[PDB]
Design a protein around this ligand. Structure first.
Ligand code: 3XO
Length: 158
């Protein structure tokens, strides 16, 4: 089991960390959701699918920077919504192919307060998302840590 990002950064067997720079809508109005879709940016696969089933959760999600300061929202994992920052580990998703498939995670973030300033700063850490991988073959229990950085500024006009 290993993963890679859209920019070509790999996290190998046994886990590790990677930086993911996410394209953000540059203007988000009061009452609108900012969508941070990681399913287009993070992909994983099973390295022995004929014999092993891999299990994958969103173990933890934490908010930082402008997201923590200025937004409130939820995380959607594999079709279900949960509080963000997270307060539990999600159910597990099966990975059963050598062909890469998305890690089905997305953030839905609503502005809390604004006076028209920069709500999210380009280059800043905005989230840490932990992917936990196990299987039905041995005792492997591995963490794939996705450090999420804003690729661009976001403004919430007023
Ligand atoms: C056709 N040939 C294929 C290769 N091959 C063999 C193995 N291959 C193999 C490859 C990767 C393995 O572990 C990693 O990938 C698993 C599947 O994603 C994850 O669950 C693990 O957590 C870990 O990330 C493991 Cl345990 C085993 C054997 O065992 C074995 O025999 C011989 C037969």
């Amino acid at each position: 089991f290993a993963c890679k990002t859209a920019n070509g950064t790999a996290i190998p067997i046994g886990g590790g960390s990677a930086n993911v720079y996410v394209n953000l809508a540059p203007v988000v109005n009061v009452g609108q959701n900012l969508v941070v879709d990681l399913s287009t940016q993070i992909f994983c696969h099973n390295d022995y699918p004929e014999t092993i089933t891999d299990y994958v959760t969103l173990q933890r999600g934490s908010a930082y920077g402008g997201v923590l300061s200025n937004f409130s929202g939820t995380v959607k994992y594999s079709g279900s919504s949960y509080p963000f920052p997270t307060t539990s580990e999600t159910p597990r998703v099966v990975y059963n192919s050598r062909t890469d498939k998305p890690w089905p995670v997305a953030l839905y973030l609503t502005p809390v307060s604004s006076a028209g300033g920069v709500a999210i700063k380009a280059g800043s850490l905005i989230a840490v998302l932990i992917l936990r991988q196990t299987n039905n073959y041995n005792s492997d229990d591995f963490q794939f840590v996705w450090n999420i950085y804003a690729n661009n500024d976001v403004v919430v006009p007023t």
